[model samples]
Target chain A: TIVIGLAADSGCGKSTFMRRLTSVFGGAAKPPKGGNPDSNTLISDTTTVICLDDYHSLDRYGRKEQKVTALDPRANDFDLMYEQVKALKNGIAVEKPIYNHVTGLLDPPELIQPPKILVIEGLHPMFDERVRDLLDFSIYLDISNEVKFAWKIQRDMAERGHSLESIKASIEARKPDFDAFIDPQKQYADAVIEVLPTTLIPDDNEGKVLRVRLIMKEGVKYFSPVYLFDEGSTISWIPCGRKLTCSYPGIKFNYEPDSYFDHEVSVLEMDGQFDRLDELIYVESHLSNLSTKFYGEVTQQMLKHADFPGSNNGTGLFQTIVGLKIRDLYEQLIANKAT
Target chain B: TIVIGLAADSGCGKSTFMRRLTSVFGGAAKPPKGGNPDSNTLISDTTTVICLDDYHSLDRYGRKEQKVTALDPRANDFDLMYEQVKALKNGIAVEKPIYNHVTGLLDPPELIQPPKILVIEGLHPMFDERVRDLLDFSIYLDISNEVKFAWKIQRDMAERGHSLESIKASIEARKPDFDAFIDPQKQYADAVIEVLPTTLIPDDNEGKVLRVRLIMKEGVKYFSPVYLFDEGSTISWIPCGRKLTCSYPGIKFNYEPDSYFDHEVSVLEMDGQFDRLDELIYVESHLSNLSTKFYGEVTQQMLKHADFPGSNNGTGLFQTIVGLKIRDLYEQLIAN
Candidate 1:
C-alpha cells in the first residue's frame, strides 16, 4: 500500500477534498458497518483514509488540564502515530486510537487493515519527523486567514447578527501554537492548495466568491509542476463558449512563478468560476503535467461531483488533478517494488 | 517648484499616464503655440512635463558613430540633465536641449520656465545620482514581457499576420541592455505599476485581457501605502450590482503585503473590470489613505474619462490614486 499525507486544520475543507479524492479511485467510501458509528476512518477499494486526531495523547479535558492547545505537540502522541503509520506502510494492521469529538475522550482502539493506498490526514501528518518519513507524497491545504473567517462569518453568524470578535479572540488564543507547530509543515509538502479571498474589488462586505491557488513545488522526486501555456512564465487567461464568446465575467486565471515560504513554486490562481462545468475541458487542454489517465480525466472527475464546494474553481480542479498525480505516483512506486 | 521623475521604456503608456496626471491639476495642458511642433514638452496650469530624450548628449548619428546604444549612459548627457533639473527645482528657468525624433538629431535648446511641478520623463531620469536627488517624488512603469508583446502582436501583426519571430529576436537583442539599465531602476521608485498577462488558464492564444499591480513602497516622505479593510491584512474583494448584486464577472481585487527587491511594498491587483463604472465608488470606499482632496474625488475623476484604457481596473485606479497622492505631496512640499 502506498502512503499519502494530507495536513490542515479542522473544517478547512479536508473532508471535502478527501471526498473529491476518494471518488476518483472509484467506489463509494463508507465507514466500516460493524465498527463504532464514530470510527474516524473511511474504507474504500483503493484507499483507507485515517484522521490524525486519533493519535491525540491528551483528550479535550486533558488538554484543558494540561493548559495546552490541541495543536501543541505536548497534547499529541507522535511516537504511537509513527509506529502505527509505519506499520501500515509496511503492510501490517494495527489497532489505532480514536479521539472521540463528542465525548472529549479517547475511545476504544479500532482495527485498521491496510489497503492499496493509505491517507493520513489532520494537524500533524507532516509534523513529526518519524511519521513524516513514512509518506510517499504529501499535500497541505493552507486556507487564507481572511477566507477562513469569511466562511465562518457566513456559516455561523450571517443569519443571526452575532458579534464576531469572539472568533478573533479565540483565534488569537490558539494562533501561537498554530503558528509554531502547524504552518511550518507546509514547506515540507510536495504541493499546497491555497484558498484566498479575491482582491478583485475592495469594500467587500459580502464575502461569497473565493480565489484559490494550486502551488506545486519544483523538483519533487516523482512529481512535476503544472503550468499554463508556457512554463516558468506568468499568464492571465479567460475561457468562454465554443464560439469563443464570453458574456459573463467568465472564469479567469493567473499563473505565475512565485516564491512561497521560501520555496520556488508555480502559483495558478482562479479568479472566477466556470459558467458551464463542461467548458472546463477547454481550460484543461491548456494545463500541463496534470498526470491524468486520459485527455479529460480531470474534467470528468469534477463533473461527477458538481455539488461540491469550490467545484467550479481551483479547489475542485487541484483536488481532482492532484488525486490523479497520487494515483500515478502510487503505480510507479508499486512497479519499483516489483522490480 | 518640485521636480518629479517618470522613467520607463517608450510606448509603455507614458503619454496616457501623463495625461491622466495632468488632468488632475485642472486646466488643459497643450503644446507651445510657437515652437518646434516636436518641442517634447507639455505645459499646464500647475505642471510642466519635459521628455528626457531631449537631454541626449549625442544625436542618432553620434550614437551610430560612437558604436553605442541609445540606452547607454554615454549617449545621454547626465551632467546637463542634473544641472537643468537642479535649475528647474531651484526656481531658475534653464535652456533645455531638445532631441528631434523625426530627424534623429539634437536641435537648438528650448527655453523652459519652471512650474509648480516639473515632471521629467525619459530613459535616464533616475539613473544618475545627481538628478535623482532633485526629485520630490518618482514613479516607475514596469511592463510585463508577455503583455507588452501581446499589445505589439495585436497592434503590429494581427491584421497583417506578419512573422512574429522578428519581434522576439529584436527584444532578445535589446534585452541585455534593458535588463542591465532599465529594470534596476524600479527599486528606486516610490511606487511601481506592473502590467502582466493573466495565467488564469493555459494554452491561451488570445492575449487581450491584462492584469495590473500597484506596488506602493513604504517609509517614503509625505506618502502612505493604501490598504483594504485592515491596514496590513491581505484581502480579495469583488463589488457589483448594488442591491449589492453582481451578475457579471465584476471587477476583482487582491491586496497583500509583499517584498519587492528587498523593500516591503503593498501590492494591489485587479483581475477583472467594472460591470458599471459608477459602482467604483463602492469599491473606492474600502480603500484607505488615497490622499484625495475630497471623498469620491477618485471615482468622480475616473467617471469623467470612463472611455480611458484600464479605467475600471488598478491601472486607472492607481494612476488616479497616485496622481492625487503626488498632488498632495507637491502641495505639502509647497507649504514647507
Candidate 2:
C-alpha cells in the first residue's frame, strides 16, 4: 500500500483538494461506516483518507485548558500518528480516534482498514519525521495569510454563522501558532501549491485574483515536474485575452528554476483570473500534467460554480493539477510494483 | 519519427544488440530491399535500423589505401550523416548509401523511408555533435580492450577465417584512433554499458568471466536509472551461494553513484557468472528500471545459447539489457 500525506491549515481548501483527488482515483468517496456525522474519514474504492485532525491530542476545551493552539505540535500526539500510519502501510487496521469539529470533543474511535492508498491529511501530516518518512509523497498547501483570511471569513461567516469581527479575531489569534508550526512543513513537501495575492492587480486588496505557484522538487521517484513548452527551460506566457480575460494584466505564467525553502524547484506559476471559463481550452492546451478527466474540468467546475471560494482564480487550477499528479503517481507506483 | 542512436566499436556486439532490440519492438526484421545481399539495413515493422557504416566516406579499399582504420572520424562523412538523420527525423525519405562490408566497396544508394523509430548504429553515431543532437536518445557500449579482443578473435577466427595474429594486428592498429575518437563519445550517451574483465576470477586473463556495469545518466527525459535494493543509495548484494553457485567468488552486485566522463551516473554492476540461468529471479528481483519484458531474459538467453560468443559473460547480459533499454527509450519517446 502507498501512503500520501497532505498538510494544510484548517480552512486552506484541504477538503476541496481531497474531493478532487478521490474523484480522480475513481468511485464516490464517503465517510467510513454507515453514520458518523462527526467522522473525519472518507472511504473510496481506491483510497481511504483519514484527517490528521483525528489524531488531535486535545479537544477544544482541552486546548483551552492547556493554553495551546490546535496548530501547536504539543497539541498533537505524533507517536500514535506514526504507529497507526506504519501499521496501515504494513496492511494492518487500527481503531483511530475521531476529533469532532462540530462538538469540539474526542468522539468514540472508528475501526479503519487499510486500502490501496492511505491519505493522512491535516495540520501535521508532514510535521513528525517518523510519519513523514512513511509517506510515499507529501503535499503542503501554502496559502498566504491574505488568501487564508479571505477563504476562512467567507466559509466561517456564511456556513458557521460567525460574525465578521469574530472571524477576524480568530485569524489574528491563530497567526503566531500557525506561523510557528504549520508554515514550516512546506519545506518537506514533494509538491506545494502556494496561493498569494496577485501582483498583477495594482493596489488590489481584495483576494479575488490570485497568484498560484506549483513548486515541484526534482529527482523524486515516480514524480516528474510538469513542464511547460519544454523541460528545464524558463518560460513566461500570456494567454490570448480572447479565451481567458484579464482587464488590467492578462493571464500571466512564469515557469523557471527557483528556490523554495532551500530546495531547487521548477516553479510553474499563474497570475491573474480566468474570465471566460467556458473557453478554457486555449489555456488548458498549453498546460501539462493536469489531473482532470478532460482538458478543462477545472474551468468547467469554475463556470458551474462561480461562487465557490477561489473559483476563476489560480487556486482552482493548481488544485486540479495537483490532484491529477497524485493519481499519476499512484498509477506509476502500482506499475512499478507489478514489474 | 524518433531517432535512436547506438554508438559502439567494431566488434562490441552491436549486431546482437540490434537483433534483440528489433525483436522487442515487434516483427521480423529484414533488409530494406527484398534480397539485397549487400544491403546494410534492417527494416522492421516498428523500427528501421540503418548502419552508421553506411555513412562511411571511405570504402574498405579506400581506408586500406589511406592507411586509416574504420574507427577514424575522417573515414566517415558526418555532414551527410547529419543531413539524412535530420531528414529522417522530419519524416522524410533519402537515398542512403550502403557500405557493403563483404564487397569492401560503397554500393548503390537505396531509397530509405522513415519509420516509427530510426536506429543509427555504428562507431561515430555520437562522435558528431550535429548528428548527436538529432538523436532522441543514445547508448554507448563500452567494451574493454581485453574483452573486445577476445570476442573479435573468437568471431573472426571461426566465422571470418582470420588468423589470430592478423586479428591481433588489426586490433592493435585501431587502438590509437579508437581511443581518440570512439571512446570519448560515451560521455554524451544517455545510457552506457561498460564491460570489463571479472574481478571474481583469480588472475583472470582469459576473459571468460566478466563484470558488467550499467551507467545511466540522471535526469534524462523519459529514462530512469536502474536501482538495486534502493534508489540513490549505494548497495552491494551477494546472492545466496546455495541458490546460485560460483567456483571462487559467488555472484556479486554493487550499485552506487559514480562519475563517468564527468557525468553523474548510477552504476549497477554484476560480478562473476550465473550458475543456473533458470534461477535468475534471485538476482532480477533486486533490480529496477530494466528495459526487458520481465527479469532474467538476459540469463535465459545466456543459458539457451551456452556456446555463443560472450555467452555466460558480461557481454551477453549487458547486450540484452541495452537492447531492452533502447526499446524502452523508443516507446517512451513515442509516448511523450
Candidate 3:
C-alpha cells in the first residue's frame, strides 16, 4: 500500500477533498461494510481512507481532564498511528479504534484491510515524525484563519444551527491549540494548497473569488507545479474582460517561482472571480503544461459537476487538481514496482 | 424649492437610490401626468427629480456627427441646464426635453412643475458653474472603475441582453469621455459617496464586499461625517470577530481626515463582508451617532428588504445610507 497523508484543521473541507480524491482514483467510495454508522473509513476501488481521529488517545472527557484540544499531539497516540499505517503498507490488516464524534467516546475497533492506497487524514497526519516517515507523499490544505472562520460560521449556523456568537467563541478557544499543534505540519507537506481571500476585488470581504496558490515542492518525484503560458519565467495575464466577464476587479493570472516553508516551489495563482461557473473553460485554456497526464480533464470534471461541494470556488479547483496529482503518483509508484 | 444636485455614471444604481430617497420622503414618485412617454421628470409629494439628460444639446445623429459622448460637455447644453434649474428652484415650471434612450432622440418637451425639492440628477448635475451656483447641496456617487465594470456587466448581460464583448467595448469606448467630463463633478459635491472594491480580502475579486467612503466636505452646512466609537481624532476599530461575524478578512472601521478631489473631508469607511443580509443591524449597532436622524431605520429597511435589487452587499448599504442623508438634508433645509 502507498500511504498518502492529508492534514488540515477541523471544518477546513478535508472530507470533501477526500471524496474528490477517492473519485479521481475511480469507483464509488463508501463507508466500510458493517461498521459504525459514523465510520470514518472510506472503502473505494483505488484507495481506502482512514480518519486519524480513530487514533485519539483521550476521549472527550479525557481531553477536558487533560486540558488539551483534539489538535494537541498529547491528546493523540502517534505510536499507534505509525504502527498501523506501517502494518497496512506491508499488506497486513489491523483493527483501528473508532472515535465516536456523536457520543464522544472510543467504541469497539473495526478491522481495516490493506488497500492499494491508504489515506491517513486528520489534523496531525504530518505532526509526528514516526508517522511522517511512513507516508510516501503528503498534502496540506492551508485554509487561512479568516477563511476558516467564515466557513465555520456558515457551516455551524446553517447545518448545525449554532449561533454566530457561540461559533466565534469556539473558534477563538481553538486558535491557540490550532496554531501551536496543527499549523506547523504544513512545512512537512510535499504539496500545499493555500486558500486565501482574493486581492482582485477591492474592499471585497465576501469569500467568493478566492485566491488559490498551488505550491509544489521543487524536485519532488512524480509531482511538478503547473505553469501558465510559460515555465521558469514570471508571467501575468489579464484576460479580455469580454472573454472572461467575471473581471469586475478584472481576471488576473500569475505563474512564478516562490518560496514556501523555506523550500523553493513554483506557484500558479488565478486572481479573479469566475463570471459564470460554466465559463471556467475560458480561464482554464490559458493554463499550459499542467502536470496531469490527461490535460484539462480535472478542470472539466470540476466544471461538469459544478454542484459538487467546493465546486463553486478555488477550493474545488485546487482539490480536483491535487486529486489528479495523487493518481499520477500512485501510477508512477506502481510502474516502478513492476519494473 | 430646495435645489439638490445628484450625479452618477450610467448603470451605477442611480434609479435604485432615487427610489430609496423617494420612500424616505414618504411619496409615490411617478412621471409627469400624461406627458412624454420617456419623461425625465419624476413628481412626488416631497420632490421633483429631473434628469439632466433633458439638457442634451446634440441629438443622437448630431452627437454621432460631432464624434462626442453624452458624457462630454460639448454634447450637452449647460446653459439650458443651468437656466432651467435656476427657474425651477425659484418655483417656476419649465418645459424640459425628453432624451429618449430607446430612440436616442430628443423628443418634444414635457411641462415640469417645481416641487419642494428639485433634484437635478444625471451625468452632469454639477458640471457647469451656473448649475453649481444654484444648488443648495450636492451629492456624487463615485462608483469605482472595478465596481462600475461589475455593475455594468451584470445589468447589461441580465437586463439589456447584450453580449459581454459588446458591453466591454462600449465601456472602453466611453472611458476617455467619462474621465474628461462626468468624473470631475465629484469635487464640487457637498457629499461624495465613493465606492471601491475592498482591499481587505487579499486577492479577493468578488464585488460583494465593498469599501464605501462617505466623504463629507468639511464646513459644509447641515452635513457632518458619521462617527464611530469616537468623533474627530482618527478613530479605528476592528470588531471582535464574534459580535459581527461576516469577516472572511475581518471587519475594519475607519474614520479619519482624508482628501477627495483636493478638498479635506472626514471619511467613514466600513471594510468587510456581511454574512447574512438580515444580520446587518448587528454591524450597524457598533456605529455610533450617524449624521442622519433616522439612523438605524434606513439600515433596517435595507436589511428588511435585503433582496431588493442591490441589497445583498455594499451597494445596498451605501445606497440606503445616502438616501437617509438626503432625507436629513431635506428636513434640515426646510427647518432653516
Candidate 4:
C-alpha cells in the first residue's frame, strides 16, 4: 500500500488534483451522482483520502475575523490528525473528518480503508514530521506563487462565494504565515515538480488553452510530453509526439522539444505547439537530473521502514519478507514476473 | 434547501436506492460513477451531499465483533454530531468526521458546505428529536424483514467484501438491534416508502425484466405501477414510462402515480412536483393529526393521549415529532 501525500498551499488546485487522482485510483469516473449535466464525473470509492483541512483547528469566528491565519498548526487538532494518519497507514480503518470550509465545523468522514496507495493531499501535509514520516513518497509541489494566488482567489470566489476584496485581503494576510510556516517545509520532499504553465491567446474568445510545461529533475527534454489527463488504462500520445495539452484554470506549456522548435514571433499568428519554446527549454534544463521513477523507488524504500512512521526498530518487517536491500528484491520480483 | 433523509433498515437497499438516486441526480444513466453504467453521477460541487454513513459511530469490529452499538444513546457522541449538523443546517461550513467501519475510528470530513439540499441517508438519522427538528423533509423506507435481510446479505457480501456466511452471521447478530432500535424508530419519518422490490425468474441463462408491484401503506397493491425510477428536475425519464426496466439486484416498481387514485395505490412513487397530492389525502386523515409529516403524523394521531412505552417525558422525541398537530399554521402561512 502506498501512502501518498498531496501537498499544496490552500487554493493551489490541490482539491482538483485530488479529484483527478481519485478518478485514476478511486475506481472509475462517470457523470455526477445528483446534480445537472454541468456537473463532472467523479471516482467514488471507499479508499480513505484524509483532508487535513478538516482538523482546521479554527472556528467560523476565527476565519471571519482573522486575528491570525487559520491554517497554522495551533489552529488544528494535531493530535487527532496524527492518530488518524497512524490508523490509516497501518491498514486499520479510520474516520478522517471532513470539514466545511464555509462553516468551519467538523463533519463526518465516511468509512474508508487504506487503499493500495494512500494519498493525503493538502496544505501542511509535510508540516508534521510525524505525518511526513508516515508517507512512503512525499512530493513537494513548488507551485509558483502567482499561480497559487490565482487559484486561491478563484476557489475562494467560486466555491466559498467570497468577494474578491475579501479573498484579496485574506491572501494578503496569509502571505507571512505561508512564508514562515509553509514554504520552508519543502526541504522534506523526495521529488519536486516545477509547474511551468504558459499563457496562450487562442483564436476563439471563449476557448483558452492552458498547459503545464513538464519539468522533471532531468535536463533531458521530453519528445512526447504527455499530460496527466484522460485517466484509466488507455494511452494517448502527444501530437506529432509534441502536442500541447491544456491544464484548466490558466496553466499552459508547449510539449514540443527543442529540435522541432522554430521560433515564431507573432502572438496572434502563433501556429504550432512550440510557439513559446524558451520557457519549455528552461523547464527541460531545470528538471534534467530528476528521475521519473524516483517516486516509485522512494515508496519501495520507505515500505522497508516501519508499517507506521518514525520507527527504525520494526521497520524491517517488509525487508524480512522481501530481503535486505528491498529495491533489488522488488526489481527482481518484477523481472521474474516478466519472465 | 432540502435535506432529504433516505432512512431505511440496514439492508433495505438504501445504498442501491441512493446509488440510483445519485445516478439520476448526477445523470450518468449509462452507468453510475463506478462500474455500473446505469448508475448515478456525484458531481463536483461546493454543495456537498454528505452521506450519514460517513458518520458511522463505530467501526465494523465495534459494531459486530465488539457489539458496541452506537445507536444506544450512550455509545454515540451526539455532541459532536449535533455541532456539525447544526452548522450545516444553518448554512455554515462545518467539518464532519470521516468514519472507518472496517476499523472504528473518526477522521476528518473533506471540504463540504451547506448544500441547497443535504441528503442525509442512513440507519438512525431521525432517532433523536434534535436531528428530526432540523429536517425540512425526510423519507423513511419501509422495506419488509425478508427483503431487508436478503438485500443486507447481498450488499454486505458484494461491497463490504464479506463472505455470504459472514454476512449471514453479522445480520443474524444485528437482527435484534434493527428490530428493536432501528425498526421501532420508523414512526419518526416524514414519508415512508416501502421498498418491496419485485423478483423475476429468467429464461435458462439470460436475465429478464423484473417489475415492481406497488404496495401502499394500507397493503393495497397498485398493478402496473409507474415507479419513480427517474424523478426531479435533473433526472430524465426513460422512454416507455410504464414499462418494466432491466433486472439486476431485483426490481422495484420504478414508476410515479398518474392520479390520486393511482397515488392512493402507490403513495411512495409520487412525483416531487405534485403539491396537492399530499394535501388532499393526508390533510384530514392521520397525517395532519400527527405532529410530524407522514409516518410521524400518522403515529402521533394513532397514539393520541396514549402513554408511550419506555418513556415518561411526555413522549419520546420521535413520538413528539410524529405527534405534532400544527398544520393549520403552516397552511395559513402558505395561503398568505
Candidate 3 per-residue lDDT over residues A82-138, each given as its tens digit: 899999999999989999998999999989989889999988899999888888889
TM-score for all models, in order of appearance = 0.51, 0.48, 0.50, 0.31
Q: Of the pair 1 and 4, which is ahead by lDDT?
A: 1
**Model 2, residue B311: what's the lDDT?**
53
Model 4 spans > 4 angstroms off:
A29-47, A63-66, A108-110, A151-166, A196-339, B1-336
The true-versus-predicted C-alpha distance at residue B121 of model 3, in Å, is 48
iRMS of each prediction in angstroms? Answer: 15.6, 21.4, 18.7, 18.0
Tell me how each candidate scores on DockQ against the true complex. 0.02, 0.01, 0.01, 0.01
User: Which ranges in model 1 have alpha carbons more than 4 Å from their true place?
Assistant: A156-168, A202-206, A240-249, A337-339, B1-336
Per-model tally of clashing residue pairs: 22, 1, 16, 90
lDDT of 1 at B60: 91
- Note the residue pairs that clash in candidate 2: A291-A324
Tens digit per residue, CA lDDT, model 4, A1-339: 256565677654445444444433443434335433322112245234556676677766775575666666777777777788788777787765656665556555545555555666667878887788787555455556554544544333453535734446666777788778877666564333333233444422211122332221212122112222111111112121122232232222122211111321101011123322332232222222122334333233333332322112111111111112222322333355433
On residues B205-273, what C-alpha lDDT tens digit does candidate 4 reach at each position?
221121222222323111121222211101112111122222223211122322332333333221111
Report the lDDT tens digits of candidate 1 across residue range B1-336.
778888878867788788888888757788777888788988998889999998887899988888777788888889999998998888999899888899998889889988888999877789988888898888998888777666665654444445433455556655787888878899889888898766433424345455778998888878888766445545555443223344345456677778989998887877665666555887777688888778999998898888777786667878898888888887887788
Give fnat of each prediction, in order. 0.00, 0.00, 0.00, 0.00
What is residue B197's positional error in candidate 4, in angstroms? 86
Write one digit per residue (lDDT tens) for candidate 2, span A1-339. Answer: 279999887767777777766766664679966757889899997899999888889999999998988898899999999999999999899999999999999899899998898989999988889998899889998888878766655453443534634446667778898888888999999899998888776633346677899898977876777766444545556554344445566677767766778788888888887766554556676667564567676566445445655666667777766767777787777887443
> Which run of 10 residues does model 3 chain A get worst, by summed lDDT?
A156-165
Ranked by lDDT, top first:
1, 2, 3, 4
Tens digits of per-residue lDDT for model 2, B1-336: 878888877556777767766766668789865646889898988889999898998999889899888888789999999999999989999999888888888988898998988899988998888998998888888888877766665554534554324444665787888889989999899888888888876653565678888888988877777776446655555554333454565677777777887888888888877655643666665577776676676556555556655555556666666667767777776676
Write the residue-wise lDDT of candidate 1 on A202-280 in tens digits.
4223444557788888777878777765466555554433433432345567777778778888878886556465567
Categorize the docking of model 3. Answer: incorrect
lDDT of 2: 0.76
